[PDB]
């Protein structure tokens, strides 16, 4: 039993809710919140910009030190950093950005990072400003993640379309 509330159950391990991931994280304080990161951990907009703003830019400060030490992530890769005031940890995961021409096949590799964590609060990878089809992202999530994932979908219209079209 966990404290996630109001989710629709899609499969044995995948759950979904129309919610602002920032507000969800502040309420639940999950062990892991997933960020929709880029390889430079520049958290300018989309989910990343919102999560970083909620940390009063502490996420960005920590991220800049991470990059200065380690260099950029790989597309499809991840790193674990602090969750600040939102979660114990933040798993920064880089899905492919279609608006940069990146290979959508890398979306499966990106979701594989979730399997290293027993329970996660997450957005749909490569959705929103990353330009992929969110219906496809949900399909890859369900077919790749085996750990318990709670998906937060900001847009109510999109949430309804994701539920109604789910096979
Ligand atoms: O980019 C966002 N979400 C996202 C990303 C890929 S899918 C997806 C979704 O919610 O379906 C996002 C979430 C919450 C926000 C925000 C942006 O700005 C203020 O609060």
Curated annotation (Swiss-Prot):
Instruction: Tell me the membrane topology, using the record's own terms.
Output: Multi-pass membrane protein
Domain Macro as annotated: residue spans: 1-167
Q: How the protein is affected by changing residue 164 to L?
A: In strain: Gamma/P.1
Record note on what altering residue 31 to A does: In strain: Mu/B.1.621
Cell location: Host endoplasmic reticulum membrane
Reaction equations catalysed: Thiol-dependent hydrolysis of ester, thioester, amide, peptide and isopeptide bonds formed by the C-terminal Gly of ubiquitin (a 76-residue protein attached to proteins as an intracellular targeting signal)
According to the UniProt entry, how is activity regulated? Inhibited in vitro by GRL-0617.
Q: How does it assemble?
A: May form homohexamers. Interacts with N protein.
This molecule's function is given as: Responsible for the cleavages located at the N-terminus of the replicase polyprotein. Participates together with nsp4 in the assembly of virally-induced cytoplasmic double-membrane vesicles necessary for viral replication. Antagonizes innate immune induction of type I interferon by blocking the phosphorylation, dimerization and subsequent nuclear translocation of host IRF3. Also prevents host NF-kappa-B signaling. In addition, PL-PRO possesses a deubiquitinating/deISGylating activity and processes both 'Lys-48'- and 'Lys-63'-linked polyubiquitin chains from cellular substrates.
This chain belongs to the protein called Papain-like protease nsp3
Q: Which gene encodes it?
A: rep
């Amino acid at each position: 039993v966990n404290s996630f509330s109001g989710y629709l159950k899609l499969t044995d391990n995948v759950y979904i809710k129309n919610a602002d991931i920032v507000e969800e994280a502040k309420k639940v304080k999950p062990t892991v919140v997933v960020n929709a990161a880029n390889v430079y951990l520049k958290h300018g907009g989309g989910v990343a910009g919102a999560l970083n703003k909620a940390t009063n830019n502490a996420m960005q400060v920590e991220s800049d030190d991470y990059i200065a030490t380690n260099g950029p992530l790989k597309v499809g890769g991840s790193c674990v950093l602090s969750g600040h005031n939102l979660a114990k940890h933040c798993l920064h995961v880089v899905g492919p950005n279609v608006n940069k021409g990146e290979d959508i096949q890398l979306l499966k590799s990106a979701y594989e990072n979730f399997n290293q964590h027993e329970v996660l609060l997450a957005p749909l990878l490569s959705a929103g400003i990353f330009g992929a089809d969110p219906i496809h992202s949900l399909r890859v999530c369900v077919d790749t993640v085996r750990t318990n994932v709670y998906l937060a979908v900001f847009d109510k219209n999109l949430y309804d379309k994701l539920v109604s079209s789910f096979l």
